[PDB]
Amino acid sequence: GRLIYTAGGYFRQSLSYLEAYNPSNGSWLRLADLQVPRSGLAGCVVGGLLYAVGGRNNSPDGNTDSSALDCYNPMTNQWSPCASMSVPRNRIGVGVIDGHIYAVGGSHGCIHHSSVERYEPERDEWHLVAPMLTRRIGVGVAVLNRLLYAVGGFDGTNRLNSAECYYPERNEWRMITPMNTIRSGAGVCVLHNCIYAAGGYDGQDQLNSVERYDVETETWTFVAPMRHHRSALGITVHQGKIYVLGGYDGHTFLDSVECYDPDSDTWSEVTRMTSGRSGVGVAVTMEP
């Protein structure tokens, strides 16, 4: 069976929690902690292994941005360090294409990156690829049809409604149609033939709106809004439904987990996280 893993996050300080939710029975399991606490990281899976990429440890003793890549194996319940990226990347976005991890954007102190690098698990090596056309932190990343999309974020001065796509065989980024809403800290995922952008912050308020990009029509369309406004949420897809986890709503660190059913265009509350937090990394893999 497959579980939704949530790694890290923030509540009072950056966290080292690894917890896994089972949609089939509503259970939560607490698994091995990350070796270093981190929030603003991203999670992904390659070959049944869970990876935690980038982030920052915002601790009582200071703020340290992370260039780390760590790998969790559900068969052993152990984390192992991998090669680190070229630079630290807080509020990074990641996508997997053909067994390789692409790390996009993020910040290191006041530096807002446009750089992008790609990890090859078989060689344990990272290499830089073409940078994005825009610097983006708090960027949402998703993969559809072996193309990588970077959506929204913050460029160091303005929050963005823009988005762009990377075409690996041409090592080139191109702008796509911008979203109808400015969003930094949105959750971005893919479902069917669309890229969804949920929540985030528009410069004034945390959002409950959700829009999707149809890659054939090049248009963005709003779908049903989430019940809760949220920014710095985790997101993933499991058995044809989108799950959003936690986040910050300007008042509370949410423990709410909502699930979108695209056939009925409705969101429902399915479980609560064990404690409220923002800036988690999320991905789906086998039970431990």
Partner: peptide, 12 residues
């Protein structure tokens, strides 16, 4: 408050 990042909630 404006000591928090409004996107993430983190203390600045």
């Amino acid at each position: 408050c404006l000591q928090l990042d409004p996107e993430t909630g983190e203390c600045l």
